[PDB]
Design a binder for these strands. Structure first.
Ligand SMILES: NC[C@@H]1O[C@H](O[C@H]2[C@@H](O)[C@H](O[C@@H]3[C@@H](O)[C@H](N)C[C@H](N)[C@H]3O[C@H]3O[C@H](CO)[C@@H](O)[C@H](O)[C@H]3N)O[C@@H]2CO)[C@H](N)[C@@H](O)[C@@H]1O
Ligand SMILES: NC[C@@H]1O[C@H](O[C@H]2[C@@H](O)[C@H](O[C@@H]3[C@@H](O)[C@H](N)C[C@H](N)[C@H]3O[C@H]3O[C@H](CO)[C@@H](O)[C@H](O)[C@H]3N)O[C@@H]2CO)[C@H](N)[C@@H](O)[C@@H]1O
Ligand SMILES: NC[C@@H]1O[C@H](O[C@H]2[C@@H](O)[C@H](O[C@@H]3[C@@H](O)[C@H](N)C[C@H](N)[C@H]3O[C@H]3O[C@H](CO)[C@@H](O)[C@H](O)[C@H]3N)O[C@@H]2CO)[C@H](N)[C@@H](O)[C@@H]1O
Ligand SMILES: [Mg+2]
Ligand SMILES: [Mg+2]
Ligand SMILES: [Mg+2]
Ligand SMILES: [Mg+2]
Ligand SMILES: [Mg+2]
Ligand SMILES: [Mg+2]
Ligand SMILES: [Mg+2]
Ligand SMILES: [Mg+2]
Ligand SMILES: [Mg+2]
Ligand SMILES: [Mg+2]
Ligand SMILES: [Mg+2]
Ligand SMILES: [Mg+2]
Ligand SMILES: [Mg+2]
Ligand SMILES: [Mg+2]
Ligand SMILES: [Mg+2]
Ligand SMILES: [Mg+2]
Ligand SMILES: [Mg+2]
Ligand SMILES: [Mg+2]
Ligand SMILES: [Mg+2]
Ligand SMILES: [Mg+2]
Ligand SMILES: [Mg+2]
Ligand SMILES: [Mg+2]
Ligand SMILES: [Mg+2]
Ligand SMILES: [Mg+2]
Ligand SMILES: [Mg+2]
Ligand SMILES: [Mg+2]
Ligand SMILES: [Mg+2]
Ligand SMILES: [Mg+2]
Ligand SMILES: [Mg+2]
Ligand SMILES: [Mg+2]
Ligand SMILES: [Mg+2]
Ligand SMILES: [Mg+2]
Ligand SMILES: [Mg+2]
Ligand SMILES: [Mg+2]
Ligand SMILES: [Mg+2]
Ligand SMILES: [Mg+2]
Ligand SMILES: [Mg+2]
Ligand SMILES: [Mg+2]
Ligand SMILES: [Mg+2]
Ligand SMILES: [Mg+2]
Ligand SMILES: [Mg+2]
Ligand SMILES: [Mg+2]
Ligand SMILES: [Mg+2]
Ligand SMILES: [Mg+2]
Ligand SMILES: [Mg+2]
Ligand SMILES: [Mg+2]
Ligand SMILES: [Mg+2]
Ligand SMILES: [Mg+2]
Ligand SMILES: [Mg+2]
Ligand SMILES: [Mg+2]
Ligand SMILES: [Mg+2]
Ligand SMILES: [Mg+2]
Ligand SMILES: [Mg+2]
Ligand SMILES: [Mg+2]
Ligand SMILES: [Mg+2]
Ligand SMILES: [Mg+2]
Ligand SMILES: [Mg+2]
Ligand SMILES: [Mg+2]
Ligand SMILES: [Mg+2]
Ligand SMILES: [Mg+2]
Ligand SMILES: [Mg+2]
Ligand SMILES: [Mg+2]
Ligand SMILES: [Mg+2]
Ligand SMILES: [Mg+2]
Ligand SMILES: [Mg+2]
Ligand SMILES: [Mg+2]
Ligand SMILES: [Mg+2]
Ligand SMILES: [Mg+2]
Ligand SMILES: [Mg+2]
Ligand SMILES: [Mg+2]
Ligand SMILES: [Mg+2]
Ligand SMILES: [Mg+2]
Ligand SMILES: [Mg+2]
Ligand SMILES: [Mg+2]
Ligand SMILES: [Mg+2]
Ligand SMILES: [Mg+2]
Ligand SMILES: [Mg+2]
Ligand SMILES: [Mg+2]
Ligand SMILES: [Mg+2]
Ligand SMILES: [Mg+2]
Ligand SMILES: [Mg+2]
Ligand SMILES: [Mg+2]
Ligand SMILES: [Mg+2]
Ligand SMILES: [Mg+2]
Ligand SMILES: [Mg+2]
Ligand SMILES: [Mg+2]
Ligand SMILES: [Mg+2]
Ligand SMILES: [Mg+2]
Ligand SMILES: [Mg+2]
Ligand SMILES: [Mg+2]
Ligand SMILES: [Mg+2]
Ligand SMILES: [Mg+2]
Ligand SMILES: [Mg+2]
Ligand SMILES: [Mg+2]
Ligand SMILES: [Mg+2]
Ligand SMILES: [Mg+2]
Ligand SMILES: [Mg+2]
Ligand SMILES: [Mg+2]
Ligand SMILES: [Mg+2]
Ligand SMILES: [Mg+2]
Ligand SMILES: [Mg+2]
Lengths: 185, 188, 260
RNA sequence: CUCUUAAGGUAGCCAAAUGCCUCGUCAUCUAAUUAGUGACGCGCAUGAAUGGAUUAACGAGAUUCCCACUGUCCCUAUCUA
RNA sequence: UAUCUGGUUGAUCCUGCCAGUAGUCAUAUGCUUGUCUCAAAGAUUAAGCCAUGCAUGUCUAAGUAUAAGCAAUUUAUACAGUGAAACUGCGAAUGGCUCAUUAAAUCAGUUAUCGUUUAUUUGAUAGUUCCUUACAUGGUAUAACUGUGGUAAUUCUAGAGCUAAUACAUGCUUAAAAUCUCGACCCUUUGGAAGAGAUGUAUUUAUUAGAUAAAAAAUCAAUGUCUUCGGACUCUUUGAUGAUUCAUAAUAACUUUUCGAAUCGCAUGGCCUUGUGCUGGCGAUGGUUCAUUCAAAUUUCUGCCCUAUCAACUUUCGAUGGUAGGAUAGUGGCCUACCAUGGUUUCAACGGGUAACGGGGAAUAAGGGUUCGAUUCCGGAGAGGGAGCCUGAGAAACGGCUACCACAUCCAAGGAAGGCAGCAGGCGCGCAAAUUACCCAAUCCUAAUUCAGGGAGGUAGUGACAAUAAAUAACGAUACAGGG
RNA sequence: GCGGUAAUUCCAGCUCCAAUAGCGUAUAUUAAAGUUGUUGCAGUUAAAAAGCUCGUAGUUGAACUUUGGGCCCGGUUAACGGGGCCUUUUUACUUUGAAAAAAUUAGAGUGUUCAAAGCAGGCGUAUUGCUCGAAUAUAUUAGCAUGGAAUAAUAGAAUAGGACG
RNA sequence: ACCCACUCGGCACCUUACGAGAAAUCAAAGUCUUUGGGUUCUGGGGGGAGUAUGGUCGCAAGGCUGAAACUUAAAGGAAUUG
RNA sequence: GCCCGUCGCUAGUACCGAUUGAAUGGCUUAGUGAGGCCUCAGGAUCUGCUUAGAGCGGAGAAUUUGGACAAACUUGGUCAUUUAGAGGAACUAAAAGUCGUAACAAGGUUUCCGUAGGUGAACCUGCGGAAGGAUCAUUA
């Protein structure tokens, strides 16, 4: 009789699986973002579709409708804050035109590459999932972390590890210690 | 035990409905105590929520009321005579409501003659004071007086003896007296 | 189902307690009170979940069993005791007092009133009848029965009630344009005045209302509590004073005082 | 296709009151059934007013079983004219 | 989140299904299996059967302590700290489980109680008890206990002797009126008067009031004052409801006469004739009616799946109604007596099926829909099948009793005991589902009650049910191919 | 559909595609399916109009009753909306509301490191501190209250037993 | 009686496709994805099969009503060329 | 070419079927009837009121009269769901058996319908249809 802890699934998988063209467009997006599996492409097209459908039934409401007012403007304000909808495209009509590369662009992986710090999307992830890209004080190792517009400027190497701070790795710190008996006693 | 539920019955369409659940105490019923004349015996029933019903088993001698006089004295209750539901109660002389019994008339005769001063149906100077005032109200009925000649009066039990434990009633008067008279003579 | 039900399940509790889904299967199940446990505050909710003074189930008892809390002038030992509308809840060692009044979302609000204004309470007279010997009597929303009352008092009034003793200090009748707090409903927790009382023979009279900002709305007569004279309550209302600011209006006020 | 002598057992029915073999075989009933019933049928030798098949009702007709019943029996005893 | 493709031909366009594709809080299975979060899980087959353990007990300053109980050394010589037992008290009717019944039934939303019951909780309510001899407080009865015992055996008990109460049974007690009756004697008018009862509350019956909307004179019986031989008449008591025979009050009685404190803990104060007199403080537990609260019972309106290879159904023996009664907590054919012949139906009754508990909800994502809901919440039902019942405020209870049927255990053969659809766990079943673990710390519930008890619950094990996150590599160098 | 001697299809090697801590299979159910068709099917010949007419139930059923004119008051981005005057003055339905459990669905807010979730949190002087939250909307049947009077029903004076004072 | 013009109501016919349909064709088989005037009946791949069973009607032959298991990728329509 | 039916073998499903066939559950007529509950009694023992001793009251065990409730047993019926069966009689699968060649060309007797009778088999014949025909056609 425990309280019924809820949940949901984050993705929607495509109807027609074998389409010869769509397969390619996804493969590119996997490379020109640096994604693990095709599920990380699905996760976003599902997010976008619910985002779109939200705006879809929102523009059906004749204007100056509080639902088209309060809700429609509570979307944009969230949609710009992450850097997806550009600083001002802001409209219910410009979210419907908003495509899949826009969210993917704002991922912590696709940022950590963007400004310095990485010089690869594969170096980016490997950097993220291993400890240190940390945003601010807190380490965030999620390659999907979704950098917000103004959280951008706070992202640099972390207070720990050879890249941002105290001590180098114990790969090298083991290398300096094996010449300790070689070049020492 | 007996069940007061309506779901052992049939639907107004006539259908017979399956037994939906068991019997529960709150829908129960219990056995009649058929109360007949005799030396007073009254059994207690432990009702719903505690409390008490009082079973009349043997009932003699309970309270009765002369309507028009506004006075009530206790008398014997000889037996039953009529009863609208079941003559079986008449024959068996059982006491219930609507009974139409017969009661001792004498304590009802005494009050009258010590009040209105006229003997019924044929010093102390303070008394003739009172009896003077109370006259001109001193005619009762031809039908209500005649029973005092016999010594027993026509009375109707208004209590629920098996419930309260008291068996009480009121002497028959008016057309209600006439109604049960036209029964007793034109039935028995 | 064979008798009285001695348990309450979390998710079956009143919503206005604002309990969290997890942390247990059960709520306190308020005791048998002056107030219906439907609409009521168990002491544990107030102390532990609102005043945040107690951290435990065992800790709330350590307070009460330390004799600390009283309610409506009298000390209350019961963990689940159902403090309802217009109550008092004095804590000497904390020097505070609280009159329980509803939010504009409809929850019991945490509302401190001073060492006075906790003297008296208001209550709605539910019925006025003849008792034994001819003695007339009157009883409030919280089940206070007060004897030999004012012949003017009828049902649907309010009564100002001294605590340490009892009885009746004046009162307020029910007619056009009186101050009213809404006891429960869609509009519960609001405050306003009487635009009209729609009479209905055989139950459920509609009471029209207007607030300080000139909004109209209706609820049930049984949930209409007279709190005083128009623009002047007889007790101290909290922030917003039951004004029902629109959801859109809310957003601004939150992003108004939010800055620098 | 043949064959003597005209044809060469059709519809039906069957170990049937018609079957030798025979207590036919299978199933059913029974603890056990040369009995009964249902089947099967190259049927020694069923079979069409020499009438064939069916058939409600009827029967001091023949037959099997069931319930009831009982000295029929176990197993005999007593009584009256 | 408005899509289709493959397959009938020599080829063709149609009809049309088969086939492909995708989703499933949908179950199984196979192969594989690293990290965080999260956590379904013997429902389906068989509400089939179950060895064993556990799951319901409970004391505050404040009912009952002479424990041959512990403990200091008690102003403590009646008791007093602690405190097993046992008595009294309260709970054991909540939980937790399961979905077998159940098709107008349950259930939902929505009414009803001017148709009832209610431990408790909160708020108020009581001067009245004897009548013609405890009120400085009546009487016995018993458990634990001790001691003599029986039986193979049980949460079995016999008889002997002690002793308690908020147990059992008893029983006094207090103001001033005022109104009623009845009435010794005084004896005339418009004439009166001691003192003898009766009056708390509840039970039972009968009767009365509970009223008004607009105003004027005549009638009868007896008064109801009053003044100065003139007779004047001044005044109508409701609380509430849409509504009552409602609340509440009145008279006459009634009653194996209900409650009306022989009750405990902390304090030790104040008076004066100083008797251990008189009076006093906050508490606890009770108690009568009333309201309240926690509930319960019935109840209005409307709404269920397949079925006509179910078309008529109900009415013996209650079917529909009327009256009276009885029974209930109370309404009612709930039951009985008498009486009538009613009641439902093609707008689908009645009957059958359901691999049917209803609902909140779930899957699917143009719209309109189709499908599912044993299962966290609510309501319902049940504890092998049936019925009956004791205690109680509440049970037709099953971790209560009694019987039957079906199981099934012990036995010394005489007898004795039992109910896992609670938690685990065993057998069985099948495609199909986990440990005989820890714990009251959390949520909470129960109690005499901050303390104790809780397989409710929580923790942990098992756990690729389902869901979230998303490692298995990253950046150069050198050696050849190749883009301005 | 593949395999009957040079197999694009079996058993394998090699490589390659697909999704990937998960992919496959069986079964159910939904979409596809306008192949259940109210929206929205089809019926000469593909599946399918009763041989024919009657006719109860059911469904369905012509039109007509205040039309038009003249001013006014207050509303929201001259178009339009709402409320009153003057002119001879019973239902079905539709709107608004109330009363609707919490979960769940939708959805606002919030940096659980992301997230699924959760309903927390946030600023501080961090030496006896401040403080905003826990929004919002929903099965549209029934019931209740309300505005609306088109549409469609229903009653009303025919031997006047009609209205009116 | 015949002719002529008009007009209802008939049994058909011709031309055109305005439209419609898979086509053959169709003044309806039109007014249909610009999908609703009212109403009745039937059909939902091919078989199995109008079989089995129950009911009912008939003297009977039979009629009316009318399944399922199982099996199968076609069956079928119109038109075209051979 | 396509193609029908009997006949012959192989496997599969359902059907009819003697067994007055079995099994499970519900509702049941009849007969019998535990148990507690109510009631008429009873009175082992113990025991109070008024006055050795007598009269009238209370407490109460076994046992018992009658009554409602009513499990359950026996015997019948009814409804439901499941199921055994010698034999019977279909249908469906698998292919290039046997017999003939019914239909598709005027398929060699146009085909088809309802009905009726007949025939190893498809089929043949009678009557009345239809054209889905092999004729939209004789104002000539
Ligand atoms: N054994 C009969 C069963 O009938 C079922 O369904 C049958 C019927 O229920 C259904 O409808 C029949 C219809 O066919 C027939 N030609 C006309 C008839 N009125 C309909 O009948 C049905 O509907 C009517 C109401 O219209 C009901 O009154 C009737 O009880 C019901 N059977 O059509 C089916 C017959 O064609 C299923 N077909 C199947 O379970 C089985 O065939
Ligand atoms: N959970 C609290 C509430 O419970 C409600 O539960 C419903 C029922 O419990 C309640 O039913 C009636 C009620 O209408 C009425 N006014 C009072 C009545 N005592 C209630 O009925 C009650 O008694 C009946 C009969 O014994 C029982 O069958 C029923 O379970 C019980 N609740 O009415 C409620 C609404 O129909 C609702 N589920 C919902 O409003 C809310 O969840
Ligand atoms: N569970 C087995 C038995 O069930 C009995 O109870 C049975 C009845 O209450 C109820 O039986 C119903 C019956 O009421 C109703 N009038 C007819 C219905 N067909 C029966 O149904 C029953 O049997 C049919 C097969 O006939 C099954 O398909 C169905 O699942 C079953 N419920 O269903 C139960 C059967 O599951 C008894 N409780 C008891 O003897 C025993 O427990
Ligand atoms: Mg009964
Ligand atoms: Mg509680
Ligand atoms: Mg409720
Ligand atoms: Mg032969
Ligand atoms: Mg011969
Ligand atoms: Mg021949
Ligand atoms: Mg012949
Ligand atoms: Mg033979
Ligand atoms: Mg023979
Ligand atoms: Mg023969
Ligand atoms: Mg023979
Ligand atoms: Mg024999
Ligand atoms: Mg034989
Ligand atoms: Mg034979
Ligand atoms: Mg033979
Ligand atoms: Mg032969
Ligand atoms: Mg021979
Ligand atoms: Mg011969
Ligand atoms: Mg011859
Ligand atoms: Mg011959
Ligand atoms: Mg012969
Ligand atoms: Mg013959
Ligand atoms: Mg015979
Ligand atoms: Mg014979
Ligand atoms: Mg014979
Ligand atoms: Mg014979
Ligand atoms: Mg003999
Ligand atoms: Mg073909
Ligand atoms: Mg498919
Ligand atoms: Mg089970
Ligand atoms: Mg389970
Ligand atoms: Mg329960
Ligand atoms: Mg049923
Ligand atoms: Mg309801
Ligand atoms: Mg004694
Ligand atoms: Mg004793
Ligand atoms: Mg003794
Ligand atoms: Mg009264
Ligand atoms: Mg108290
Ligand atoms: Mg009749
Ligand atoms: Mg009976
Ligand atoms: Mg009656
Ligand atoms: Mg009655
Ligand atoms: Mg009743
Ligand atoms: Mg009749
Ligand atoms: Mg079921
Ligand atoms: Mg269901
Ligand atoms: Mg359910
Ligand atoms: Mg959807
Ligand atoms: Mg949809
Ligand atoms: Mg669709
Ligand atoms: Mg089930
Ligand atoms: Mg199910
Ligand atoms: Mg439940
Ligand atoms: Mg069991
Ligand atoms: Mg008791
Ligand atoms: Mg129960
Ligand atoms: Mg229980
Ligand atoms: Mg039980
Ligand atoms: Mg148990
Ligand atoms: Mg022995
Ligand atoms: Mg278990
Ligand atoms: Mg197994
Ligand atoms: Mg599993
Ligand atoms: Mg499972
Ligand atoms: Mg705890
Ligand atoms: Mg504890
Ligand atoms: Mg202690
Ligand atoms: Mg899994
Ligand atoms: Mg590895
Ligand atoms: Mg090869
Ligand atoms: Mg392939
Ligand atoms: Mg290969
Ligand atoms: Mg569809
Ligand atoms: Mg529509
Ligand atoms: Mg179609
Ligand atoms: Mg056709
Ligand atoms: Mg027909
Ligand atoms: Mg959500
Ligand atoms: Mg019209
Ligand atoms: Mg459409
Ligand atoms: Mg078909
Ligand atoms: Mg036929
Ligand atoms: Mg037939
Ligand atoms: Mg063709
Ligand atoms: Mg065969
Ligand atoms: Mg019987
Ligand atoms: Mg008996
Ligand atoms: Mg066979
Ligand atoms: Mg045969
Ligand atoms: Mg040949
Ligand atoms: Mg051939
Ligand atoms: Mg031929
Ligand atoms: Mg020839
Ligand atoms: Mg030839
Ligand atoms: Mg030839
Ligand atoms: Mg021919
Ligand atoms: Mg032909
Ligand atoms: Mg012939
Ligand atoms: Mg032959
Ligand atoms: Mg054809």
């Amino acid at each position: 009789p425990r309280a019924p802890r809820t949940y949901s699934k984050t993705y929607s998988t495509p109807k027609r699986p074998y389409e010869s063209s769509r397969l390619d467009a996804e493969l590119k997006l996997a490379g020109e973002f640096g994604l693990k599996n095709k599920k990380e492409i699905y996760r976003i097209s599902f997010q976008l579709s619910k985002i779109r459908r939200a705006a879809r039934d929102l523009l059906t409401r004749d204007e100056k409708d509080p639902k088209r007012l309060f809700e429609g403007n509570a979307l944009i304000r969230r949609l710009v804050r992450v850097g997806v909808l550009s600083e001002d495209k802001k409209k219910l009509d410009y979210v419907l035109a908003l495509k899949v590369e826009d969210f993917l662009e704002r991922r912590l992986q696709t940022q950590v590459y963007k400004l310095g710090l990485a010089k690869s999307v594969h170096h980016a992830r490997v950097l993220i999932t291993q400890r240190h890209i940390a945003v601010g004080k807190q380490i965030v190792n999620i390659p999907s972390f979704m950098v917000r517009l103004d959280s951008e400027k706070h992202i640099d190497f972390a207070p720990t590890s050879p890249f941002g701070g105290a001590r180098p790795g114990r790969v090298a710190r083991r290398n300096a210690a094996r010449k300790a008996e070689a070049s020492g006693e | 035990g007996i069940s007061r539920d309506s779901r052992h019955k049939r639907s107004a369409t006539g259908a017979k409905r399956a037994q939906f659940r068991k019997k529960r105490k709150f829908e129960l019923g219990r056995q009649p105590a058929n109360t007949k004349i005799g030396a007073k015996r009254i059994h207690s029933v432990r009702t719903r929520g505690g409390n008490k019903k009082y079973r009349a088993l043997r009932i003699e001698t309970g309270n009765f009321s002369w309507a028009s006089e506004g006075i009530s004295k206790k008398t014997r209750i000889a037996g039953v005579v009529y009863h609208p539901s079941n003559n079986e109660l008449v024959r068996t002389n059982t006491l219930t409501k609507a009974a139409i019994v017969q009661i001792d008339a004498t304590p009802f005769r005494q009050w009258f003659e010590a009040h209105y001063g006229q003997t019924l149906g044929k010093k102390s100077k303070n008394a003739e004071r009172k009896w003077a005032a109370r006259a001109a109200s001193a005619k009762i009925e031809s039908s209500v007086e005649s029973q005092f000649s016999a010594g027993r009066l026509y009375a109707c039990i208004s209590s629920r003896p098996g419930q309260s434990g008291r068996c009480d009633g009121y002497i028959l008067e008016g057309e209600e007296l006439a109604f049960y008279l036209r029964r007793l003579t034109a039935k028995k | 189902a064979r008798g009285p039900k001695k348990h309450l399940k979390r998710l079956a509790a009143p919503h206005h307690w604002l309990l969290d889904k997890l942390s247990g299967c059960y709520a306190p199940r308020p005791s048998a009170g002056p107030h219906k446990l439907r609409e009521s505050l168990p002491l544990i909710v107030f102390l532990r979940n609102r005043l945040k003074y107690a951290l435990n189930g065992r800790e709330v008892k350590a307070i009460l069993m330390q004799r600390h809390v009283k309610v409506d002038g009298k000390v209350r030992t019961d963990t689940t005791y159902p403090a309802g509308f217009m109550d008092v809840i004095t804590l000497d060692a904390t020097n505070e007092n609280f009159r329980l009044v509803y939010d504009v979302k409809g929850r019991f609000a945490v509302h401190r009133i001073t060492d006075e204004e906790a003297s008296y309470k208001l209550g709605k007279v539910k019925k006025v009848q003849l008792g034994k010997k001819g003695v007339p009597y009157v009883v409030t929303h919280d089940g206070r029965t007060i004897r030999y009352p004012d012949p003017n008092i009828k049902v649907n009034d309010t009564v100002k009630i001294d605590l340490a003793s009892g009885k009746i200090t004046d009162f307020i009748k029910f007619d056009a344009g009186k101050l009213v707090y809404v006891t429960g409903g869609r509009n519960l927790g609001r405050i306003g005045t009487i635009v009209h009382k729609e009479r209905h023979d055989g139950g459920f009279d509609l009471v029209h209302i207007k607030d300080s900002l000139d909004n109209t709305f209706v609820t049930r007569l049984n949930n209409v509590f007279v709190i005083g004279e128009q623009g002047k309550p007889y007790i101290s209302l909290p922030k917003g004073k039951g004004i029902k600011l629109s959801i859109a209006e809310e957003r601004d006020r939150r992003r108004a005082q939010q800055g620098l």
